[PDB]
């Protein structure tokens, strides 16, 4: 089908969301003012998926911006494409959430959630046939994690037949030395297992490791990390925005990629890796299955692919991709499950990103993602066993039993992943 | 009973109140219902100056709560580097073991406070120390693929 | 003259349908606007081509056909294509949201939103007929619309048109060009629910057609466009007997009489020869004996299987072009001893022969060379059981773990329908075994 409504919530959600819109606007010939300056009609066929058409032939992003911290509003406005979002679509509270999931989910964030829903309804009713939602956020803070999961749940209550898709940035001690973030992410994962159809797991442990160890950036910044994110989000949404041959939408993605309802957490991957200032088809198909090119800090060779999608971008032989994908699928045979036949899908798109002649984007549903959940589970449990700072949460009305249940659900998820790794 | 007030003052970083209570006979080694001392809470919540005044007034730097946690355990878990160093300078047992078999080194590694890991190694933390699951600090770094930690632990 | 209505369901059915009707037009001398200078009877007629084309009175010849798809993208290409003026607008029907590769969405939820509109539009076409004989239904096995909506449609047509024949052209999935991982599920589900309702079904194995484009036509990477022009040549050869004078397969009932000895084993095999690249324009022409031999080579089959394994129950050979009946008899006489061809003991070993003395048409822009003679063989051989077995194996692998089943249960289907459909395929495979394979 067609239209997607995008919500970005909290600091990380808004910072990576803003870069997403700068990146695809340049790909679609949209300028900071909104006017179309492209030289190819292929940029306009499916522009309706992400942009509404305004009077005077100007395209406004189907984008909703929410935070409990008003300071985020001014920052997005002060960006280059900051004067393109609908001012009516800015929804900002008074006091933030102070990295407190419970303030996002139960108190401060709950008070604002009706106002966000009003603009979601307005943006939804003006869609010909809305296919679903996307949400950008971090799991480690208070607003994106706490208020984001609340907003997801109320949306899924009111739009139970539409697809809910998230880009969810997982915390790393290497990037944020804030010890309550295992709490916030675990409590959110509990909700995400139940209330999203498909979740892209973007891991700041991966992004930092990529910049530092591979890109030689001695001191990575959020700008450096989000350059990686922006390339990934552009890649995974390529089929949604250009014609190609995959009549692309989010629900077909879910049907083909998610064999079991809870195992809907994707490991993305990108090639080539590049910095913010600085290839053959066989080199791409090899990098795409390399652990160092994943955006989730785990080893695909420690598990088994259930389902995989690739998107090649640029000018290349359809046969050369088909042949190389065949090759990679033969040498790595013991890393694909054998009870889902034909479980690797290739897409090709003529239009490459900016500054690249050819790129590849990987989307994998792999049992190896349990290593990310195991990592967060260990850190959650270390803090939880000493009950460190638990009163910051219970003081907002949370019951302590909500921690053990989130912890039990995450260990159940790691187990479910292991079962289908073992299966034959 | 001034012990309950010292406990709250130490948690909330109220330096003035801590001094006043100690001068009026407050039990520096009072415990809450779980066995935490004022030193436990000052180390937990990062109040360096309160840690230092408590240690000049008879705090047991190696007190344990009912779970076996020392102040050094909690400082290493939460990541309060300057307090870790003060605790070691005043006699903390670098290899104290809690009821999960965790040492401070285990906790600092798990939480990724790499500066604290280096500090503890340089004071004799036991790299062979196993938790109740058999895991050493090095085991954690391998099962998590934390290459920075594993490098640190090889010195 | 008795009328046939064609129904094209989903992307595969619509795109192949567009290819077939173009070729039909070229065969009969109908222009893209519906004008037919050769029809001396204006506004009416009882000629053989009227089984497929009605007439308006201003001289327009209009396909007896309806296109349907649950989203608009593919039918919009017919509305704006070269033959846009050919079809009535009201016989091109679209929803706004597809079945998402999910049989249950096409059958139970989304498909129920459009089924009554589709039945009413079909009724209008049927009301124009004076002796409707039945329906030719084109669809994929793999799509949510092609599988799920087609079985819903087939159920309703059996209630509203109990006495009429229903034939299928069905696209069987192949890994090379497939779209979804759950296509084995959709294939078995629709097969199960359509079986009682379909009298004869011609399966087109996308792998077989792909391999023919690569081998015979030298197309390194065939696309849908190449596959569909080839498939349309074969569909035309099957339906030519319905559209022209002849003495074999002259109405829908005779298809069944000739090719379906028992109702459930109603899946005949089509073979076609010669397929020659349009770059070989001056090629030496092949004799009747040569092209007839070629029909017993597995590589020329529209479904991948090995007929030398199984056993024949029926065999019709339909010739087009410069074909002398005595030369066919001599060809058949040879291909009864020098090849491993075994009929079932309870069936006559007779081959049925029909000849149309006009050579086949090629579409401009196509991949095929003009030929002076060509042949399509339709057979019912137990060897087609191999196609079902390869399908059932893939199904079984995923269903044992219940992979993807929740997407179907979430769309109003009960999980017991999975087991009952697979049990039906087990019975169908055994049906072929008893006869002999
Ligand atoms: N031969 C041929 N096969 C096609 C064509 N289009 C799609 N297919 C095949 O049909 C199957 C996919 O089903 P579709 O017909 O695309 O699905 P649909 O009926 O439109 O149903 P939805 O799920 O609602 O999109 C795959 O096996 C494709 O390879 C075509 O034009 N020609
Ligand atoms: N990769 C990346 N991570 C971010 C960014 N901004 C914040 N984070 C991470 O997000 C987490 C903190 O959440 P944040 O979005 O700042 O809190 P919120 O404003 O309450 O939603 C920490 O893990 C940060 O490292 C960003 O621009 N890029
Ligand atoms: C296991 O086999 C498979 C795996 C993935 C498959 N489809 N992948 C996509 C489909 C998309 O929309 C149709 C899409 O557009 C949103 C997309 O962009 C990321 C990928 C198909 C399969 O048969
Ligand atoms: Ca006439
Ligand atoms: Mg379709």
């Amino acid at each position: 089908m067609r239209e997607i409504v995008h919500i970005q919530a909290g600091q990380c959600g808004n910072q990576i969301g803003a870069k997403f819109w700068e990146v695809i606007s340049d790909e679609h010939g949209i300028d900071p003012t909104g006017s179309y300056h492209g030289d190819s009609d292929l940029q306009l066929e499916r522009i309706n998926v992400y942009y509404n058409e305004a009077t005077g032939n100007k395209y406004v992003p189907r984008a909703i911006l929410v935070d409990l911290e008003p300071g985020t509003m001014d920052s997005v406005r002060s960006g280059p494409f900051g004067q393109i979002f609908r001012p009516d679509n800015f929804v900002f509270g008074q006091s933030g959430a102070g990295n407190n999931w419970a303030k996002g989910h139960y108190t401060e964030g709950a008070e604002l959630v009706d106002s966000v829903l009003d603009v979601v309804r307005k943006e939804s009713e003006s869609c010909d046939c809305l296919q679903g939602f996307q949400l950008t956020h971090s799991l480690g803070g208070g607003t994106g994690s706490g208020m984001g999961t609340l907003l997801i749940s109320k949306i899924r209550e009111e739009y139970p037949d539409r697809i809910m898709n998230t880009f969810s940035v997982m915390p790393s001690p290497k990037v944020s030395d804030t010890v309550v973030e295992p709490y916030n992410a675990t409590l959110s994962v509990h909700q995400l297992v139940e209330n999203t159809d498909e979740t892209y797991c973007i891991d700041n442990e991966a992004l930092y490791d990529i910049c530092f160890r591979t890109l030689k950036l001695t001191t990575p910044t959020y700008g450096d990390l989000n350059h990686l994110v922006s390339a990934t989000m552009s890649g995974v949404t390529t089929c949604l925005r250009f014609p190609g041959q995959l009549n692309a939408d989010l629900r077909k993605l879910a049907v083909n990629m998610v064999p079991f309802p809870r195992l809907h957490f994707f490991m993305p991957g990108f090639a080539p890796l590049t910095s913010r200032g600085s290839l053959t088809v066989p080199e791409l198909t090899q990098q795409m299955f390399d652990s160092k090119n994943m955006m989730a800090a785990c080893d695909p060779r420690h598990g088994r692919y259930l389902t995989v999608a690739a998107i090649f971008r640029g000018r290349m032989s359809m046969k050369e991709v088909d042949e190389q994908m065949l090759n990679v699928q033969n040498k790595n045979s013991s890393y694909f499950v054998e009870w889902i036949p034909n479980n690797v899908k290739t897409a090709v798109c003529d239009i490459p990103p900016r500054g690249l002649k050819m790129s590849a984007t990987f989307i994998g549903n792999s049992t190896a993602i349990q290593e990310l959940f195991k990592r967060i589970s260990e850190q959650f449990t270390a803090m939880f066993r000493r009950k460190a700072f638990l009163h910051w949460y219970t003081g907002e009305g949370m019951d302590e039993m909500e921690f053990t249940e989130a912890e039990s659900n995450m260990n159940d998820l790691v187990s479910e992943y292991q079962q289908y790794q073992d299966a034959t | 009973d001034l012990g309950k007030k010292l406990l709250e003052a130490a948690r909330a970083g109220q330096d003035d109140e801590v001094r006043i209570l100690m001068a009026n006979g407050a039990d520096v080694n009072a415990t809450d219902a779980s066995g935490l001392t004022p030193l436990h809470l000052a180390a937990t919540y990062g109040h360096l100056e309160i840690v230092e005044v408590l240690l000049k007034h008879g705090a047991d730097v190696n007190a344990i709560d009912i779970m076996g946690s020392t102040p050094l355990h909690l400082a290493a878990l939460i990541g309060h580097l300057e307090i870790v160093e003060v605790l070691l300078k005043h006699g903390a047992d670098v290899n104290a073991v809690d009821t999960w078999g965790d040492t401070p080194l285990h906790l600092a590694a798990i939480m990724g406070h790499l500066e604290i890991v280096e500090v503890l190694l340089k004071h004799g933390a036991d790299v062979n120390a196993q938790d109740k699951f058999g895991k050493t600090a090095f085991d954690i770094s391998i099962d998590n693929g934390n290459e920075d930690l594993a490098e640190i632990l090889q010195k | 003259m008795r009328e046939c209505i064609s129904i094209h369901v989903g992307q595969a059915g619509v795109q192949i349908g567009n290819a077939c009707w173009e070729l039909y037009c070229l065969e009969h001398g109908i222009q893209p606007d519906g004008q037919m200078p050769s029809d001396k009877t204006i506004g009416g007629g009882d000629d053989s081509f009227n089984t497929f084309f009605s007439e308006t009175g201003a001289g327009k010849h209009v396909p007896r056909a309806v296109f349907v798809d649950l989203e608009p993208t593919v039918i919009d290409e017919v509305r704006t294509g070269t033959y846009r003026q050919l079809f009535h607008p009201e016989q091109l029907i679209t929803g706004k949201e597809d079945a998402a590769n999910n049989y249950a969405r096409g059958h139970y939820t989304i498909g129920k939103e459009i089924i009554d509109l589709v039945l009413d539009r079909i009724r209008k076409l049927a009301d124009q007929c004076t002796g409707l004989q039945g329906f030719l239904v084109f669809h994929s096995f793999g799509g949510g619309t092609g599988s799920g909506f087609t079985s819903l449609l087939m159920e309703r047509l059996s209630v509203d048109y109990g006495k009429k024949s229903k034939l299928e052209f069905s696209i069987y999935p192949a890994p090379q060009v497939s779209t979804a991982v759950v296509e084995p599920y959709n294939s078995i589900l629709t097969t199960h629910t359509t079986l009682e309702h379909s009298d004869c079904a011609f399966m087109v194995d996308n792998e077989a057609i792909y391999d023919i484009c690569r081998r015979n036509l030298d197309i390194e990477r065939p696309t849908y466009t190449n596959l569909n022009r080839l498939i349309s040549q074969i569909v035309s050869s099957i339906t030519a007997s319905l559209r022209f004078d002849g003495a074999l397969n002259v109405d829908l009932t005779e298809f069944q009489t000739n090719l379906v000895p028992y109702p459930r084993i109603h899946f005949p095999l089509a073979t076609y020869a010669p397929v020659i690249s349009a770059e070989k324009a001056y090629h030496e022409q092949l004799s009747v004996a040569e092209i007839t031999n070629a029909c017993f080579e597995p590589a020329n089959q529209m479904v991948k299987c090995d007929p030398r394994h199984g056993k024949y129950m029926a065999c019709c050979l339909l010739y087009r072009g410069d074909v002398v009946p005595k030369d066919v008899n001599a060809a058949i006489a040879t291909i009864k001893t020098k090849r491993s061809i075994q009929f079932v003991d309870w069936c006559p070993t007779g081959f049925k022969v029909g000849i149309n003395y006009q050579p086949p048409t090629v579409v401009p822009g196509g991949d095929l060379a003009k030929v002076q003679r060509a042949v399509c063989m339709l057979s019912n051989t137990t060897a087609i059981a191999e196609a079902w077995a390869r399908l059932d194996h893939k199904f079984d692998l995923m269903y044992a773990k219940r992979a993807f089943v929740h997407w179907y249960v979430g769309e109003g289907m009960e999980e017991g329908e999975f087991s009952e459909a697979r049990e039906d395929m087990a019975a169908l495979e055994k049906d072929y075994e008893e006869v002999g394979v």
Side-chain angles (χ1 to χ4, degrees), chain C residues 195-211:
Chain C
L195 200 47
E196 183 201 342
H197 297 299
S198 187
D199 309 299
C200 187
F202 294 94
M203 281 191 295
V204 186
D205 177 358
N206 263 350
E207 189 172 315
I209 308 291
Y210 191 89
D211 282 346

PDB file of all heavy atoms in Angstrom, chain C residues 195-211:
ATOM      1  N   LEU C 195     -10.250 -27.634  -4.776  1.00  0.00           N
ATOM      2  CA  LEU C 195     -10.244 -28.926  -5.462  1.00  0.00           C
ATOM      3  C   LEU C 195     -11.650 -29.373  -5.849  1.00  0.00           C
ATOM      4  O   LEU C 195     -11.928 -29.647  -7.021  1.00  0.00           O
ATOM      5  CB  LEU C 195      -9.568 -29.959  -4.563  1.00  0.00           C
ATOM      6  CG  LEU C 195      -9.002 -31.246  -5.151  1.00  0.00           C
ATOM      7  CD1 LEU C 195      -8.163 -30.968  -6.391  1.00  0.00           C
ATOM      8  CD2 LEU C 195      -8.166 -31.929  -4.093  1.00  0.00           C
ATOM      9  N   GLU C 196     -12.564 -29.426  -4.879  1.00  0.00           N
ATOM     10  CA  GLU C 196     -13.939 -29.833  -5.166  1.00  0.00           C
ATOM     11  C   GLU C 196     -14.618 -28.938  -6.199  1.00  0.00           C
ATOM     12  O   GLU C 196     -15.561 -29.386  -6.864  1.00  0.00           O
ATOM     13  CB  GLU C 196     -14.754 -29.843  -3.869  1.00  0.00           C
ATOM     14  CG  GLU C 196     -16.190 -30.313  -4.016  1.00  0.00           C
ATOM     15  CD  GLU C 196     -17.083 -29.846  -2.870  1.00  0.00           C
ATOM     16  OE1 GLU C 196     -16.550 -29.457  -1.812  1.00  0.00           O
ATOM     17  OE2 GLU C 196     -18.322 -29.869  -3.036  1.00  0.00           O
ATOM     18  N   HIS C 197     -14.140 -27.707  -6.388  1.00  0.00           N
ATOM     19  CA  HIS C 197     -14.842 -26.706  -7.182  1.00  0.00           C
ATOM     20  C   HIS C 197     -14.267 -26.488  -8.575  1.00  0.00           C
ATOM     21  O   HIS C 197     -14.832 -25.702  -9.335  1.00  0.00           O
ATOM     22  CB  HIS C 197     -14.850 -25.363  -6.450  1.00  0.00           C
ATOM     23  CG  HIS C 197     -15.579 -25.395  -5.152  1.00  0.00           C
ATOM     24  ND1 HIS C 197     -16.916 -25.709  -5.060  1.00  0.00           N
ATOM     25  CD2 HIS C 197     -15.155 -25.157  -3.890  1.00  0.00           C
ATOM     26  CE1 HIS C 197     -17.289 -25.651  -3.795  1.00  0.00           C
ATOM     27  NE2 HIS C 197     -16.240 -25.319  -3.064  1.00  0.00           N
ATOM     28  N   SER C 198     -13.161 -27.132  -8.922  1.00  0.00           N
ATOM     29  CA  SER C 198     -12.480 -26.908 -10.187  1.00  0.00           C
ATOM     30  C   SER C 198     -12.493 -28.208 -10.979  1.00  0.00           C
ATOM     31  O   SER C 198     -12.128 -29.260 -10.450  1.00  0.00           O
ATOM     32  CB  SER C 198     -11.044 -26.434  -9.947  1.00  0.00           C
ATOM     33  OG  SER C 198     -10.412 -26.052 -11.152  1.00  0.00           O
ATOM     34  N   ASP C 199     -12.918 -28.145 -12.237  1.00  0.00           N
ATOM     35  CA  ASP C 199     -13.056 -29.367 -13.023  1.00  0.00           C
ATOM     36  C   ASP C 199     -11.780 -29.770 -13.743  1.00  0.00           C
ATOM     37  O   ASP C 199     -11.636 -30.936 -14.137  1.00  0.00           O
ATOM     38  CB  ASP C 199     -14.178 -29.202 -14.060  1.00  0.00           C
ATOM     39  CG  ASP C 199     -15.467 -28.692 -13.441  1.00  0.00           C
ATOM     40  OD1 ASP C 199     -16.021 -29.382 -12.562  1.00  0.00           O
ATOM     41  OD2 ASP C 199     -15.910 -27.590 -13.810  1.00  0.00           O
ATOM     42  N   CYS C 200     -10.875 -28.828 -13.952  1.00  0.00           N
ATOM     43  CA  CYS C 200      -9.662 -29.023 -14.729  1.00  0.00           C
ATOM     44  C   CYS C 200      -8.768 -27.828 -14.442  1.00  0.00           C
ATOM     45  O   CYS C 200      -9.252 -26.694 -14.407  1.00  0.00           O
ATOM     46  CB  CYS C 200      -9.987 -29.124 -16.233  1.00  0.00           C
ATOM     47  SG  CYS C 200      -8.596 -29.546 -17.252  1.00  0.00           S
ATOM     48  N   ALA C 201      -7.484 -28.080 -14.205  1.00  0.00           N
ATOM     49  CA  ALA C 201      -6.564 -27.016 -13.810  1.00  0.00           C
ATOM     50  C   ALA C 201      -5.227 -27.243 -14.485  1.00  0.00           C
ATOM     51  O   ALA C 201      -4.606 -28.290 -14.276  1.00  0.00           O
ATOM     52  CB  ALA C 201      -6.391 -26.964 -12.286  1.00  0.00           C
ATOM     53  N   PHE C 202      -4.784 -26.255 -15.274  1.00  0.00           N
ATOM     54  CA  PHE C 202      -3.491 -26.283 -15.953  1.00  0.00           C
ATOM     55  C   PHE C 202      -2.461 -25.534 -15.109  1.00  0.00           C
ATOM     56  O   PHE C 202      -2.456 -24.297 -15.069  1.00  0.00           O
ATOM     57  CB  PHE C 202      -3.591 -25.670 -17.350  1.00  0.00           C
ATOM     58  CG  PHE C 202      -4.448 -26.475 -18.298  1.00  0.00           C
ATOM     59  CD1 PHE C 202      -5.792 -26.182 -18.455  1.00  0.00           C
ATOM     60  CD2 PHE C 202      -3.913 -27.548 -18.985  1.00  0.00           C
ATOM     61  CE1 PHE C 202      -6.590 -26.939 -19.301  1.00  0.00           C
ATOM     62  CE2 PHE C 202      -4.700 -28.310 -19.834  1.00  0.00           C
ATOM     63  CZ  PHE C 202      -6.039 -28.004 -19.990  1.00  0.00           C
ATOM     64  N   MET C 203      -1.570 -26.284 -14.477  1.00  0.00           N
ATOM     65  CA  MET C 203      -0.509 -25.697 -13.677  1.00  0.00           C
ATOM     66  C   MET C 203       0.666 -25.260 -14.540  1.00  0.00           C
ATOM     67  O   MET C 203       1.126 -26.003 -15.422  1.00  0.00           O
ATOM     68  CB  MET C 203      -0.048 -26.684 -12.624  1.00  0.00           C
ATOM     69  CG  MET C 203      -0.982 -26.730 -11.444  1.00  0.00           C
ATOM     70  SD  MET C 203      -0.230 -27.668 -10.116  1.00  0.00           S
ATOM     71  CE  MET C 203      -0.135 -29.291 -10.867  1.00  0.00           C
ATOM     72  N   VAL C 204       1.135 -24.040 -14.287  1.00  0.00           N
ATOM     73  CA  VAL C 204       2.305 -23.461 -14.935  1.00  0.00           C
ATOM     74  C   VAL C 204       3.376 -23.306 -13.859  1.00  0.00           C
ATOM     75  O   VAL C 204       3.216 -22.509 -12.923  1.00  0.00           O
ATOM     76  CB  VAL C 204       1.981 -22.110 -15.591  1.00  0.00           C
ATOM     77  CG1 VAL C 204       3.167 -21.606 -16.388  1.00  0.00           C
ATOM     78  CG2 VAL C 204       0.713 -22.215 -16.479  1.00  0.00           C
ATOM     79  N   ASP C 205       4.451 -24.085 -13.978  1.00  0.00           N
ATOM     80  CA  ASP C 205       5.570 -24.092 -13.030  1.00  0.00           C
ATOM     81  C   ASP C 205       6.566 -23.019 -13.461  1.00  0.00           C
ATOM     82  O   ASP C 205       7.252 -23.172 -14.478  1.00  0.00           O
ATOM     83  CB  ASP C 205       6.204 -25.483 -13.010  1.00  0.00           C
ATOM     84  CG  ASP C 205       7.428 -25.601 -12.100  1.00  0.00           C
ATOM     85  OD1 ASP C 205       7.894 -24.620 -11.459  1.00  0.00           O
ATOM     86  OD2 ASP C 205       7.934 -26.737 -12.038  1.00  0.00           O
ATOM     87  N   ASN C 206       6.630 -21.926 -12.698  1.00  0.00           N
ATOM     88  CA  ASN C 206       7.518 -20.818 -13.037  1.00  0.00           C
ATOM     89  C   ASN C 206       8.960 -21.275 -13.222  1.00  0.00           C
ATOM     90  O   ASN C 206       9.710 -20.669 -14.002  1.00  0.00           O
ATOM     91  CB  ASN C 206       7.448 -19.724 -11.956  1.00  0.00           C
ATOM     92  CG  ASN C 206       6.493 -18.583 -12.316  1.00  0.00           C
ATOM     93  OD1 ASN C 206       6.008 -18.487 -13.446  1.00  0.00           O
ATOM     94  ND2 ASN C 206       6.221 -17.710 -11.343  1.00  0.00           N
ATOM     95  N   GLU C 207       9.375 -22.341 -12.531  1.00  0.00           N
ATOM     96  CA  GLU C 207      10.736 -22.822 -12.745  1.00  0.00           C
ATOM     97  C   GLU C 207      10.895 -23.392 -14.146  1.00  0.00           C
ATOM     98  O   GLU C 207      11.921 -23.181 -14.797  1.00  0.00           O
ATOM     99  CB  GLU C 207      11.110 -23.879 -11.712  1.00  0.00           C
ATOM    100  CG  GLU C 207      12.576 -24.245 -11.774  1.00  0.00           C
ATOM    101  CD  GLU C 207      12.991 -25.137 -10.636  1.00  0.00           C
ATOM    102  OE1 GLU C 207      12.599 -24.840  -9.488  1.00  0.00           O
ATOM    103  OE2 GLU C 207      13.690 -26.136 -10.896  1.00  0.00           O
ATOM    104  N   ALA C 208       9.880 -24.112 -14.620  1.00  0.00           N
ATOM    105  CA  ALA C 208       9.943 -24.699 -15.951  1.00  0.00           C
ATOM    106  C   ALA C 208      10.012 -23.613 -17.019  1.00  0.00           C
ATOM    107  O   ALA C 208      10.860 -23.663 -17.917  1.00  0.00           O
ATOM    108  CB  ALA C 208       8.738 -25.609 -16.168  1.00  0.00           C
ATOM    109  N   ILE C 209       9.152 -22.598 -16.907  1.00  0.00           N
ATOM    110  CA  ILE C 209       9.111 -21.528 -17.897  1.00  0.00           C
ATOM    111  C   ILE C 209      10.396 -20.714 -17.848  1.00  0.00           C
ATOM    112  O   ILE C 209      10.942 -20.325 -18.885  1.00  0.00           O
ATOM    113  CB  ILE C 209       7.862 -20.656 -17.658  1.00  0.00           C
ATOM    114  CG1 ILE C 209       6.599 -21.530 -17.593  1.00  0.00           C
ATOM    115  CG2 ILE C 209       7.742 -19.547 -18.718  1.00  0.00           C
ATOM    116  CD1 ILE C 209       6.193 -22.161 -18.912  1.00  0.00           C
ATOM    117  N   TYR C 210      10.912 -20.464 -16.639  1.00  0.00           N
ATOM    118  CA  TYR C 210      12.201 -19.795 -16.488  1.00  0.00           C
ATOM    119  C   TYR C 210      13.311 -20.544 -17.225  1.00  0.00           C
ATOM    120  O   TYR C 210      14.095 -19.942 -17.969  1.00  0.00           O
ATOM    121  CB  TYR C 210      12.521 -19.674 -15.001  1.00  0.00           C
ATOM    122  CG  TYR C 210      13.682 -18.786 -14.634  1.00  0.00           C
ATOM    123  CD1 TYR C 210      13.487 -17.436 -14.402  1.00  0.00           C
ATOM    124  CD2 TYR C 210      14.959 -19.309 -14.449  1.00  0.00           C
ATOM    125  CE1 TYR C 210      14.525 -16.621 -14.027  1.00  0.00           C
ATOM    126  CE2 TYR C 210      16.016 -18.492 -14.071  1.00  0.00           C
ATOM    127  CZ  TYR C 210      15.788 -17.146 -13.868  1.00  0.00           C
ATOM    128  OH  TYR C 210      16.814 -16.301 -13.504  1.00  0.00           O
ATOM    129  N   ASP C 211      13.391 -21.861 -17.030  1.00  0.00           N
ATOM    130  CA  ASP C 211      14.463 -22.641 -17.638  1.00  0.00           C
ATOM    131  C   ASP C 211      14.359 -22.656 -19.154  1.00  0.00           C
ATOM    132  O   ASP C 211      15.383 -22.735 -19.841  1.00  0.00           O
ATOM    133  CB  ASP C 211      14.456 -24.070 -17.092  1.00  0.00           C
ATOM    134  CG  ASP C 211      15.070 -24.167 -15.707  1.00  0.00           C
ATOM    135  OD1 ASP C 211      15.737 -23.199 -15.285  1.00  0.00           O
ATOM    136  OD2 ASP C 211      14.879 -25.206 -15.043  1.00  0.00           O
TER     137      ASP C 211
END
